[PDB]
Structures are given as structure tokens and as C-alpha cells.
Motif scaffolding. Structure first.
Motif, short mmCIF file in Angstrom:
data_model
loop_
_atom_site.label_atom_id
_atom_site.label_comp_id
_atom_site.label_asym_id
_atom_site.label_seq_id
_atom_site.Cartn_x
_atom_site.Cartn_y
_atom_site.Cartn_z
N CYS A 50 0.65 -1.07 0.38
CA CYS A 50 -0.34 0.01 -0.51
C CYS A 50 0.79 1.43 0.31
CB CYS A 50 -0.32 -0.17 1.21
SG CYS A 50 -0.03 -0.26 2.78
N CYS A 52 0.18 3.81 2.41
CA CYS A 52 0.04 4.28 3.70
C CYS A 52 0.53 5.44 3.98
CB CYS A 52 -0.88 3.79 4.50
SG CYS A 52 -2.60 2.69 4.74
N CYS A 110 -0.56 -0.29 9.60
CA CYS A 110 -1.00 -0.17 9.29
C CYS A 110 -2.71 -1.01 9.05
CB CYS A 110 -0.94 0.72 7.88
SG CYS A 110 -0.87 -0.19 6.51
N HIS A 112 -2.82 -2.08 6.35
CA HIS A 112 -2.46 -3.60 5.80
C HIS A 112 -1.57 -4.85 6.30
CE1 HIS A 112 -4.14 0.23 3.00
NE2 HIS A 112 -5.05 -1.29 2.64
ZN ZN Z 1 -1.76 0.32 4.81
#
Ligand code: ZN
Ligand code: A1B28
Length: 139
Positions: A50, A52, A110, A112
Motif C-alpha cells: 500500500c 498508507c 497499518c 494492511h
Molecule cells: Zn496500508
């Protein structure tokens, strides 16, 4: 201290790697302060895939987790250290937060999964070495 355990890999700060980590070396990058060694047992941590810029990190010097906003991975002044000298960590993310040297290895996560590990900081900052780009950790 601290590590990430994913599949048959162990991800640690390169400056904290042990003799066994170096005897079972898979990859290391001095510019990133990362070292990956092989393990016999299977790890079950999930790496985030990701972009983030918010998450939570563990701070051993406070026995606490803190929520933080952090910068995207970039090339950044690492204060010439004992293990290293001046130069710009690559793949490093900064946040405003408490840290001490033994804080290195604390995980930043995070929604994820694992984003990185504490690797720089000081004067009210904390640096994390990103691992989201290491797609090979998942195979
Ligand atoms: Zn993330
Ligand atoms: C959380 S680190 C910290 C925290 C407060 C004060 C000082 C520090 C700095 C420190 O002692 N370091 C450990 C060794 C090398 C640089 C950061 C690491 C690197 N990745 O180049």
C-alpha cells in the motif's frame, strides 16, 4: 530490538543483525539499514502492500504503541552513527514521535499489515525503514 517474521524470512535492522543472521544471509542493504536472514520455521506476519501514510508503531522505551502520520519512503540525513557515518538512508519514512536507540526494531503497522521497522530518529523524530517494496518477502 525486534524483527519481522514472514514465510521463511526474518527481517531485522542491519546494525542489530546477529552472527546467525549473517550465517543465513538472504539479502542486506547498508543504505537501508535492513538485513533478511532465512529461518527454518514459518513466520505468519503479513507485509502491507500500500501507500498508507498513517499507522501505529511500538515504542519499547515507553512500553506503548503510538499512532503516527509518516512521510513516503525517501533518501534522508542519517546522523553519522557508530555503525555507519553520515549519508541519506534510502527508503526511510519520518514521523513526529518519541524514540531512543534501543527502539530500533519496533514494528510500524497499518490496516494492511507491517509497513516497516524503527531504524532512525531523535530530537522528537522517529525513522522507520520501509519494507512494503520488498515483494519477494511473500514468496
Ligand atoms: Zn496500508
Ligand atoms: C531510534 S534511533 C535514535 C533514537 C534517539 C536518539 C538517537 C538515535 C540514533 C541511533 O542511535 N541510531 C542507531 C544506529 C544508526 C542510526 C540511528 C541507525 C541507522 N539506521 O543509520
Amino acid at each position: 530490538s525486534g524483527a519481522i517474521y514472514v514465510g521463511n524470512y526474518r527481517v531485522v535492522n542491519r546494525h542489530l543483525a546477529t552472527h546467525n543472521d549473517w550465517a543465513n544471509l538472504v539479502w542486506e542493504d547498508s543504505s537501508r539499514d535492513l538485513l533478511v536472514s532465512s529461518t527454518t520455521a514459518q513466520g505468519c506476519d503479513t507485509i502491507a502492500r500500500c501507500d498508507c501514510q498513517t499507522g501505529v508503531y511500538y515504542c519499547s522505551s515507553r512500553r506503548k504503541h503510538y499512532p503516527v502520520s509518516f512521510s513516503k519512503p525517501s533518501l534522508i540525513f542519517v546522523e553519522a552513527s557508530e555503525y555507519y557515518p553520515a549519508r541519506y538512508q534510502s527508503h526511510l519514512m519520518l514521523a513526529v514521535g518519541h524514540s531512543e536507540p534501543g527502539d530500533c526494531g519496533g514494528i510500524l503497522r497499518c490496516q494492511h499489515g507491517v509497513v516497516g521497522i524503527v531504524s532512525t530518529g531523535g530530537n522528537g523524530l522517529v525513522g522507520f525503514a520501509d519494507v512494503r517494496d520488498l515483494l519477494w518477502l511473500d514468496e
